Write a protein that binds this ligand. Structure first.
Ligand code: NAP
Ligand code: G6P
Length: 315
């Protein structure tokens, strides 16, 4: 239960450490602490601008022999400005460089939406809108498949894909490698029952991101819902003598999901690990599910008119 079996035969640790918003000056210590504490799965991305510093931590713990490379499960993601078939290998290689590794365990397409290649992560026109690429999902998928054949990555997957977009890849003529993982937003306010049931029926593992509601998202507001401070969730935690964070992390785990909470605080990274040793009742689970309000932290709102925008479909 500490690891789930992927369709490529590998085993993915059900708990991982997230690194979006982890400042460069703090994330090396954060990752060293996590590995020491017993984390074996780190979620990364080129767009987080801190992979070099994550890589410093991974190298220090490998050199120290705290972990063997084979025990670690390192994830990164292909950013939207590199969807072109000819840019994919290079994007993967730059991430490998920064992280100081010679293969990734899992490489995800970060969003289904391709943007204009360039130095800008969000290329804008003079009208301030995001300039798309004309690339499609299937071509980018074909490029990702040959990363597997080249030995650069062990498995490939997708992130923020809706079920029709997953369908598209699954029905691709001559599909060689299925998506191993779809990483999506999921917590009590966005429970994702339909999509999770869809992916799990197709043998695709689901990873829940922003499990605590991403209280540090740069676009946060005061009137905004807060999971960590929902009295109903505080109550379920009190009953178990756990923290509301530990309840919010255990919740996806009991849905057979992988979950990747972010912290750069050593006490919280430790607190977040102690979630293997208790059980939410079925009443707790059904209750937590009933809190769904279809509320999204990450709606990629600047791309709502992109041909590949994922969140117009029901699921
Ligand atoms: N695929 C995608 O498009 C996508 C999108 C969003 C997220 N993700 C991944 O999912 C990871 C997690 O999502 P996220 O960063 O949005 O947020 P999250 O994990 O839901 O929340 C992180 C926030 O919770 C705080 N926190 C962590 N543990 C806590 C605890 N024990 N008690 C109180 N506060 C706690 C953290 O503070 P401190 O850090 O100060 O402790 C941080 O401010 C990301 O870092 C990224 O790796 C992927
Ligand atoms: O950074 P992620 O949430 O993993 O997804 C990628 C992008 O989407 C949102 O978060 C913002 O527009 C940026 O902070 C980021 O460049």
């Amino acid at each position: 239960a500490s690891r789930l079996l992927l369709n490529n035969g590998a085993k993915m640790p059900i708990l991982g450490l997230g690194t979006w918003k982890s400042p460069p000056g703090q994330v090396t210590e954060a990752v060293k602490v996590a590995i020491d504490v017993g984390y074996r799965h780190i979620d990364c991305a080129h767009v987080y601008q801190n992979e070099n510093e994550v890589g410093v931590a991974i190298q220090e713990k490998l050199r120290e022999q705290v972990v063997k490379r084979e025990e670690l499960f390192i994830v990164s993601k292909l950013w939207c400005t590199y969807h072109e078939k000819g840019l994919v290998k290079g994007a993967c290689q730059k991430t490998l460089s920064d992280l100081k590794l010679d293969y990734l365990d899992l490489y995800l397409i970060h969003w289904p939406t391709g943007f204009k290649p360039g130095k800008e992560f969000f290329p804008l026109d003079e009208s301030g809108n995001v300039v798309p690429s004309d690339t499609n999902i299937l071509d980018t998928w074909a490029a990702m498949e040959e990363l597997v054949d080249e030995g650069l990555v062990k498995a490939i997957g997708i992130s923020n894909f809706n079920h029709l977009q997953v369908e598209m890849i699954l029905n691709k003529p001559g599909l060689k490698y299925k998506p191993a993982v779809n990483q999506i937003e999921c917590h009590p306010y966005l429970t994702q029952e339909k999509l999770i049931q869809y992916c799990q029926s197709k043998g695709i593992v689901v990873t829940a991101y922003s499990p605590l509601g991403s209280p540090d998202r740069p676009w946060a507001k005061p009137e905004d819902p807060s999971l960590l401070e929902d009295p109903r969730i505080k109550a379920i935690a009190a009953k178990h003598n756990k923290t509301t964070a530990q309840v919010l992390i255990r919740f996806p785990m009991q849905r057979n999901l992988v979950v990747i909470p972010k912290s750069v605080t050593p006490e919280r990274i430790a607190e977040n690990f102690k979630v293997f040793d208790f059980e939410l009742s079925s009443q707790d689970m059904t209750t937590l599910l009933s809190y769904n309000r279809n509320w999204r932290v990450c709606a990629l709102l600047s791309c709502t008119s992109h041909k590949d925008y994922p969140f117009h479909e029901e699921f």
